[PDB]
């Protein structure tokens, strides 16, 4: 019968704390606080939030797209996932001074930083084979050979690449950690949109830990979410007020449906979310 | 539920590691207890978080920061000030066990001094003339605070993968982010690895002071220092000393005074700073790993 304190309670309490204690400014207008941390257990559960329906197909296709090393919004949009599309549009690139760049070209965003770190970005169709540091593979290789290493870090915040990117990274850095055959990951997110992005961000890095745990032969342990600037847009306060009234249902489980040897070999069909019973969708105006 | 404040957050982390920390070995052989992921918020508002449950080497904190600020990677330059904490990490015998034999005694690699004033430059040696090369992240932080304080990208890096091959001891501190609201400056430090007994009380005072410095140059008031840890470990040989420390009751934090209006970060001198109403318990000797 009795269940552990649901992990969603940490998110909802970060909401209620920003609503109660945050200070107001602009950017549509925000309530904001600086410095938060929550710990989401990954052991026999998957922290896909239940107090609204989170866009799981979005989370999954987006990560498969990072791992592929794509920086082309259209490669994701073609999977039915539109979330990067406004950032690669003609006007949006133009208004950043990227007028010679083709539609969709996001510059050196996550997929590039993860697979080609430090290489010279040209364009999104370019071939980067064996340029840059493949941080993701190095991470996997170190977990498999020295799991006690205290420098297992993948870096997305690259100061040289900021002026080339269609969006500055929300996510600065990941650190991985292994104890007793369990893999944890802590994400430093320098800026979080709490209503609209964070529930998605939480599912993303939890899924990346599951995938890494899978290919390194380990068990998923915790996902530690650390925020810098944590903000709620004002147009989200009322919907969040309603979200807070709802009771979390038990987290679902994530099944991986076959043995996968390499990280580039995961496909969308290898994943099954099971027993996901969310409260109804909440639309937050982006 | 009311969170622990002040020094008590530090004693509680120690206590959680002693109890819940699992046994591991590190790259020095010494044995550690470790946990992963921790966070504390140290107010800087009309107090300064120099630990009182043991005496912290304040002149060491101050002098080390002044050394980072001037761009230095040479342990010898801090040593000559009477502060020996980086000595061991630049010794022939420590350097030798990292294929770093062409590097002169005391050349620490592209550590914090290089990273803050010359980021993304090409390191060589500790004597080399780096004027005009790399990004001066520290000056950038300051100027951004004066011009666009609401900016949520005020981040200073010490962790550069491209430079990892060139380093003896790779940064314990990966990044700082800075944050301004209602004319208050906060700083959050992401510490990928924290030696809880020896270094972390030094790290706390250190980044506190940096925040106080950048506040003063910008005419802002100090907000909070948020300390976030990745791997947080206690050396086995630190347990007995820490057990002694944990039975002592904390006394109020002291106050930090800046004794004159300084213009630029580089112009701060040791004598500009006064610590007032520091009443710590006795020193507790702990062995450096
Ligand atoms: N083991 C270890 N090595 C490290 C660090 C660390 O925290 N731990 N550091 C992390 O950045 C750097 C140096 N930091 C240090 C800070 C303080 C002391 C120390 O022994 N403090 C004494 C001061 C006594 C005195 O000299 O008067 C003490 O407080 O007991 C050592 C290293 C580089 N290497
Ligand atoms: Cl090409
Ligand atoms: Cl002035």
Author numbering:
A (entry chain A): 23 to 49, 53 to 311
B (entry chain B): 24 to 312
What does the paper say about this structure?
The replacement of Arg175 with a cysteine results in the complete loss of enzyme activity, proving that Arg175 is fundamental to anchor the substrate inside the catalytic cavity. The structure of the HT-hTS R175C was solved to 2.25 Å resolution, showing the constitutive dimeric quaternary structure of the enzyme. Within each enzyme homodimer, both subunits adopt the active conformation, showing the catalytic Cys195 exposed inside the active site cavity. In all subunits, Cys195 results oxidized to S-oxy-cysteine (CSX195). Indeed, an extra-electron density, whose shape is highly compatible with a folate-like molecule, is observed in only one catalytic cavity of each dimer. The refinement demonstrated that the ligand is a tetrahydrofolate (THF) derivative since the pyrazine ring of the folate pteridine moiety was in a bent conformation peculiar of the cofactor reduced form. 5-FTHF is stabilized into the cofactor binding site of HT-hTS R175C by a tight network of H-bonds and van der Waals interactions in analogous pose to that assumed in EfTS. Nonetheless, HT-hTS R175C displays the active conformation despite the high-salt condition (precipitant solution including 25 % saturated ammonium sulfate, corresponding to a concentration of ~ 1 M) applied to crystallize the protein. Even though the variant is able to accommodate a sulfate anion in this site, its catalytic inefficiency indicates that dUMP binding is impaired, strongly suggesting that Arg175 is pivotal to anchor the substrate.
